[PDB]
Amino acid sequence: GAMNSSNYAELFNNDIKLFVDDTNVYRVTVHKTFEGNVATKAINGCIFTLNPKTGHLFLKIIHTSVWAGQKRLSQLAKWKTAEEVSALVRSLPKEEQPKQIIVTRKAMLDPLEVHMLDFPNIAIRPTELRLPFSAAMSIDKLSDVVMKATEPQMVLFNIYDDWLDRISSYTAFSRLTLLLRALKTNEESAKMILLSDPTITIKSYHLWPSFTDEQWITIESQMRDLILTEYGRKYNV
Amino acid sequence: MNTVPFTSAPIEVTIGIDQYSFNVKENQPFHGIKDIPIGHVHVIHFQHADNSSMRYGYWFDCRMGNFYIQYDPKDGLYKMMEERDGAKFENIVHNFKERQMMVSYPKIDEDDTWYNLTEFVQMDKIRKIVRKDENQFSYVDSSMTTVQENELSDPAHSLNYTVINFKSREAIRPGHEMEDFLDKSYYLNTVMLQGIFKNSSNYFGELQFAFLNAMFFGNYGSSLQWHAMIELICSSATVPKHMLDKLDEILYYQIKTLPEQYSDILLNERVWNICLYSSFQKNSLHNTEKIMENKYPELL
């Protein structure tokens, strides 16, 4: 069934599972043509496939060449996502293949289901959670590798850096989603908060700064505050 | 013209023959239906006055034998049986008529309704769907489940409709995932028409039989089967033109004949709106579209 607040801790048990987010697979800019009509220009995109328990991220870069000469691109994007996720499962050894795949948008269900017919025992699930994975392109290193790519490419990351050495999956995912929520709601302020202190650096093999435990506490409170303020502004509360 | 005599009518029951029906009172001297048109299948069905649940009945074709009805007080229902003694049967039929205890199959000469609903229905294919090979006629009732329903319990009592499933390997060629799921032409024409049904008439016959069972017994799995077979055509970009024209006729007479009060459970809003307005064939069901809009605009 669907994933929601009730069955949230299922994400951190030992059943292998992956989130798939397709929001950044098909990305365009909109511009005017010489005759004044509107046209789109595609830029490189990515599939965000994440194991919430281990932090392993499978960033499948979607090169603009994929779209060449194709119609109905936003619909094709869903099938290309499903094609690529299926290939990823096929590429993994049996004991690493997931038992569930949770799609962040319900429109992916039919395309993934069809692409996964060879895997009847892998459950394809929607979610009612409003996960902020669209903001993954606000993480500088991820956006950089996507935009520089010249061909299709899979890049692997651990989206939790080394946090699991010191905190649980549950807490790691809560931090990640808080950081991404903040970045989605006001990217400029979120990014200001993470980097204001020049003495806290990002390891070459990491995505986020090397905060101490106490600094993570201050950061998380700053991100909380950021998010509440923006809410009042949005709704005038 | 053929006859189906009844031994008696011990229990009050509404009897139907095709789209006609008669109320018969407990131990009323009713002894059969005559003037049944040779050349088509027929269905004789029952609903007891005391149980407005379990409509049941028998598909038959009089060319295949002499059939009669007899009430069984152990099993408590009207049973169809074959009389093998041709002379003993003509003798019963002649005497009951002489006494005039038989109702006449009430066909208006202008009316092609029954032919239009049963055009492609053939007793032989019915007996493959309702497998009970010791009888020449086929029993169906309100509660019988289909082979597909069973997969998701007693198989001797199953409706063995052809299994259609849009999200199956059968329906989806590896590597044509997106193509085959959005345009089911492959599934329709190669897998189902050339592969399983062999020709469009067998396909239409199962479609029409599934409709009739849904209409006459409220068999829910038959409704599911009828909708699926409509959707498979309408969701195919490439359909023989003769199939589309015949389909519009087929669906027209089905919609025409449905009781107005049952349009809520018998018509699947999604399928019909998709077939009439979204599908590849939105523009190919002009008659079916025109009757649907003038009779059931609510559903749409």
From Swiss-Prot, chain A:
Annotated stretches, region: RNase H homology domain: 7-237
Going by the entry's taxonomy, the superkingdom of the source organism is recorded as: Eukaryota
Give its localization: Nucleus
Q: What is the effect of changing D22A?
A: Reduced growth at 30 degrees Celsius. Strongly reduced growth at 16 degrees Celsius. Strongly reduced growth at 35 degrees Celsius
Impact reported for R105K: Severely impaired growth. Reduced growth at 30 degrees Celsius. Strongly reduced growth at 16 degrees Celsius
According to the UniProt record, which cysteines are disulfide-bonded? none
What's the subunit arrangement here? Component of the U4/U6-U5 tri-snRNP complex composed of the U4, U6 and U5 snRNAs and at least PRP3, PRP4, PRP6, PRP8, PRP18, PRP31, PRP38, SNU13, SNU23, SNU66, SNU114, SPP381, SMB1, SMD1, SMD2, SMD3, SMX2, SMX3, LSM2, LSM3, LSM4, LSM5, LSM6, LSM7, LSM8, BRR2 and DIB1.
Query: What other remark does the UniProt record contain for this protein?
Result: Present with 468 molecules/cell in log phase SD medium.
Give the protein's biological function: Functions as a scaffold that mediates the ordered assembly of spliceosomal proteins and snRNAs. Required for association of BRR2 with the spliceosomal U5 snRNP, and the subsequent assembly of the U4/U6-U5 tri-snRNP complex. Functions as a scaffold that positions spliceosomal U2, U5 and U6 snRNAs at splice sites on pre-mRNA substrates, so that splicing can occur. Interacts with both the 5' and the 3' splice site, as well as the branch region. Has a role in branch site-3' splice site selection. Associates with the branch site-3' splice 3'-exon region. Also has a role in cell cycle.
According to its record, what is known about the domains? Answer: The MPN (JAB/Mov34) domain has structural similarity with deubiquitinating enzymes, but lacks the residues that would bind the catalytic metal ion. Contains a region with structural similarity to reverse transcriptase, presenting the classical thumb, fingers and palm architecture, but lacks enzyme activity, since the essential metal-binding residues are not conserved.
The protein's name is Pre-mRNA-splicing factor 8
Q: Which organism is it from?
A: Saccharomyces cerevisiae (strain ATCC 204508 / S288c) (Baker's yeast)
Q: What is the lineage of its organism?
A: Eukaryota, Fungi, Dikarya, Ascomycota, Saccharomycotina
Instruction: Specify first residue, last residue and whole-protein length for the fragment.
Output: 1836 to 2069 of 2413
From Swiss-Prot, chain B:
Phosphothreonine occurs at T257
Question: Does this UniProt record's set of keywords contain Translocase?
Answer: no
* High-level lineage: Eukaryota, Fungi, Dikarya, Ascomycota, Saccharomycotina
Please list the residues that carry the modification Phosphoserine: S236
Gene behind the chain: AAR2
Region (Leucine-zipper) residue ranges read: 244-265
This protein's name = A1 cistron-splicing factor AAR2
Q: Name one Pfam family in it.
A: AAR2_1st
State the GO CC annotations.
Answer: cytoplasm; U5 snRNP
Its chief place of residence is cytoplasm
The record's comment on protein family reads:
Belongs to the AAR2 family.
Assembly description: Heterodimer. Interacts with PRP8 (via RNase H homology domain and MPN domain), competing with BRR2 for the same binding site. Component of a U5 snRNP complex that contains at least the U5 snRNA, PRP8, SNU114, AAR2, SMB1, SMD1, SMD2, SMD3, SME1, SMX2 and SMX3, but is not a component of the U4/U6-U5 tri-snRNP complex.
Quote the function comment for this protein.
Component of the U5 snRNP complex that is required for spliceosome assembly and for pre-mRNA splicing. Involved in splicing pre-mRNA of the A1 cistron and other genes that are important for cell growth.
The cross-references to PANTHER family, in alphabetical order and at most eight, read: A1 CISTRON SPLICING FACTOR AAR2-RELATED, PROTEIN AAR2 HOMOLOG
Q: Which UniProt keywords apply?
A: Cytoplasm, mRNA processing, mRNA splicing, Nucleus, Phosphoprotein
Q: Which GO terms describe its biological process?
A: spliceosomal snRNP assembly; spliceosomal tri-snRNP complex assembly
On modification after translation, the UniProt record reads: Phosphorylated on serine and tyrosine residues.
Q: What else is known?
A: Present with 7330 molecules/cell in log phase SD medium.
From what organism does this protein derive? Answer: Saccharomyces cerevisiae (strain ATCC 204508 / S288c)
What is the annotated localization of this protein?
Answer: Cytoplasm; Nucleus
